[PDB]
Design a protein around this ligand. Structure first.
Ligand SMILES: Cc1cc2nc3c(=O)[nH]c(=O)nc-3n(C[C@H](O)[C@H](O)[C@H](O)COP(=O)(O)O)c2cc1C
Ligand SMILES: Cc1cc2nc3c(=O)[nH]c(=O)nc-3n(C[C@H](O)[C@H](O)[C@H](O)COP(=O)(O)O)c2cc1C
Ligand SMILES: O=c1ccc2cccc(O)c2o1
Ligand SMILES: O=c1ccc2cccc(O)c2o1
Ligand SMILES: O=c1ccc2cccc(O)c2o1
Ligand SMILES: O=c1ccc2cccc(O)c2o1
Ligand SMILES: O=c1ccc2cccc(O)c2o1
Ligand SMILES: O=c1ccc2cccc(O)c2o1
Lengths: 359, 359
């Protein structure tokens, strides 16, 4: 099956096309990960997936989404990832990490603790920053502070330091979080970016923060290790054709700038939208980006059904299939998929201590 | 459903009736467990099972089944279990451990490395000990050395030290491995025990090693923590009625001796047998033992089908349902079962970081 064919990008080879997309656990303390993450990630790596991308890890304290988000804004924070990275590699999976900055969606409660912006008097909260002083709305009403040019320079450097730390911690795959309405996505979208300086207005100006951050990270990230990003290419806000055209153009600039693969998603920049949720609904859009930008891609949402994952790959809509929630339900989803697709010696998708007894 | 009703034994309360039986991983080095076990066990504990019994852990070096078996024959070996025990508890599952001695089945290769007795010239091998100098046969042809009274005293003390270490490491449930043809089972069976001293011949003499070991362990194992054992009650060797009668009588002596629960299994003492393998095939025998010995029991083999587990409990054939291989296939089997049985808020069988998104 196509789902179980290896994939090589730069000097890295994934044993199959199954990728576990970044999934926040909200279990870190002051940005420091712990045994929750170690067992969670090591267990997933042993499950069989070819690539395991660690959850959105903040490049700065205020870049966290919640008080439970992981961070890599200091060398001590990076050190915490070392044993985890080594456990993922020992399991045969490729360790990746998504570095991010929540922007105006920062300083929010954990999903099961309100999922809304933290109250002004809560000692855990903090001031959010963004391209412009405009709130997301809905459950995230906090108005962020408009970033100064110095804030921009500082955040870009935070991304560079985060990438440098990821590199030294042993990660072999990096993903810049430019999607889901967080800082990067918000600089590109006219909904959230009303700036009149070099970082707002035109397509080039709105693209600037993302392109400069990618270029800056590229200086410290090894050429032989996949350099990727997640980016929302449309919002389903009634401006889809225009937005997709601009997003694809930016994807072309990313490719020219050294991006090896693009994780295609939706913007989630504003709440007033009408997203046509459905199993593998992103397939068609991902394929269009892959084709018009001539860049490898991955996407997600509902690919937890083996046959769907297989079909998406065979149709060349995606290069890697990202499966998220199915892996929270069953860390050994790769094994379940191998069986479902009739892969020979499907049990050996898992380590010997398990495989021997399941064959 | 009955599968998800809590269970209290002594001072310990299991959140449900799902027990993960001991399952050797063959990943230890010189008896020392490592991160394979830590992630494996912690992951299983987070999966939802109410009780997690750690694999057969050798009370002495020669008591290991293979060079990859876990051991607890020294305080350093016990220390290795401390972080694991604490991770299991943090997950809400009860940490248990099966202490054992492989007897004549010791010094064998890992299952995926031959599964047979290690060659005489292999530097990893060792002399096996047993009640009598008689080999198992088949793939385990090595003739063990007949134990002296001093060997018996020493092994009993090894079990005591192992239990004392398990206690101090934080385990809240202990299981003496008197089944599957290893040392304990071999002392009870006339197939393997041809001794003429106080430890062989009569029912009382063949029961002696097991009863004395239980009594000795009882002196160091807390009264408020479940004291259990796994025991093969029949062999399917043509002497079933006679063997079951004696096994049930020994179970009565175990109960009188402080045993809180008995894990009912098959002897596997010799290779020439005809075991009627089938889903939940042990159910009827387990029920007979539970009834005639008036002792709580658990059993296993094929209970990985939610409905079967539920049925066994409702029929009072078992008090706890042991599910093994299904947990190797899917560490979150408890979640799969909760869904299958229509349990309310089935996703919360798992921790919040997973449950929130699966509901
Ligand atoms: C708990 C949870 C945490 C997530 N965390 C992240 C994240 O940190 N970064 C990101 O880009 N997407 C994140 N996502 C979105 C997932 O990566 C994925 O695209 C989404 O779950 C859809 O795929 P699925 O249907 O296979 O779950 C998360 C989703 C869930 C359910
Ligand atoms: C890998 C593996 C390791 C096992 N290790 C042990 C052990 O250490 N001690 C024991 O008493 N039984 C052991 N067993 C037997 C299991 O506890 C259980 O009774 C058996 O797998 C039948 O249940 P199942 O059909 O749910 O897998 C093992 C079985 C497997 C497959
Ligand atoms: O699409 C999603 C859903 C949940 C989520 C959570 C944290 C960060 C993200 O980027 C997320 O993206
Ligand atoms: O892209 C680069 C630049 C410098 C460098 C130096 C050492 C090892 C690498 O992998 C490197 O990769
Ligand atoms: O891309 C880079 C740039 C600098 C560098 C320095 C040391 C090791 C690396 O792997 C590096 O990689
Ligand atoms: O029934 C079984 C099957 C495998 C096994 C492996 C180690 C120890 C045991 O007690 C076992 O018991
Ligand atoms: O059974 C016993 C005997 C002594 C003892 C001492 C401290 C704590 C315990 O739980 C104990 O339990
Ligand atoms: O059963 C026993 C016997 C002795 C003992 C000693 C300390 C702590 C315990 O928990 C103990 O438990």
């Amino acid at each position: 099956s196509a789902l179980f064919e290896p994939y090589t990008l730069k000097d890295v080879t994934l044993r199959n096309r199954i990728a576990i997309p970044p999934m926040c656990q909200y279990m870190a303390e002051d940005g420091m990960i712990n045994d929750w993450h170690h067992v969670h990630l090591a267990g997933l790596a042993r499950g069989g997936a070819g690539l395991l991308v660690v959850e959105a890890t903040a490049v700065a304290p205020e870049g966290r989404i919640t008080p439970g988000c992981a961070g890599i804004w200091s060398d001590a924070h990076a050190q915490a990832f070392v044993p985890v990275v080594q456990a993922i590699k020992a399991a045969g999976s490729v360790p990746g990490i998504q570095i991010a900055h929540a922007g105006r969606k920062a300083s929010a409660n954990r999903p099961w603790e309100g999922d809304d912006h933290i109250a002004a008097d809560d000692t855990r909260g903090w001031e959010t920053i963004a391209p412009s002083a405009i709130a997301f709305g809905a459950h995230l009403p906090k108005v962020p502070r408009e970033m100064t040019l110095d804030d921009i320079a500082r955040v870009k450097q935070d991304f560079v330091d985060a990438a440098r730390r990821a590199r030294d911690a042993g990660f072999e795959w990096i993903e810049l979080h430019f999607a889901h309405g967080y800082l990067g996505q918000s600089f590109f979208s006219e909904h959230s970016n009303k700036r009149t300086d070099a970082y707002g207005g035109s397509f080039d100006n709105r693209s600037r923060f993302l392109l400069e951050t990618l270029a800056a990270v590229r200086e410290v990230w090894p050429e032989n290790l996949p350099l990727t990003a997640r980016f929302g290419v449309l919002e389903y806000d009634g401006r889809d054709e225009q937005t997709l055209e601009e997003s694809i153009e930016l994807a072309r600039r990313f490719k020219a700038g050294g991006l090896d693969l693009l994780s295609v998603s939706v913007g989630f920049t504003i709440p007033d939208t009408n997203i046509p949720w459905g199993p593998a609904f992103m397939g068609p859009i991902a394929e269009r980006v892959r084709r018009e930008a001539k860049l490898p891609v991955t996407s997600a949402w509902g690919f937890g059904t083996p046959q769907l994952a297989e079909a998406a790959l065979q149709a060349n809509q995606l290069d890697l299939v990202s499966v998220g929630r199915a892996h929270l339900a069953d860390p050994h989803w790769a094994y379940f998929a191998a069986k479902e697709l009739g892969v020979e010696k499907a049990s050996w998708t898992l380590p010997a201590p398990y495989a021997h007894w399941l064959e």
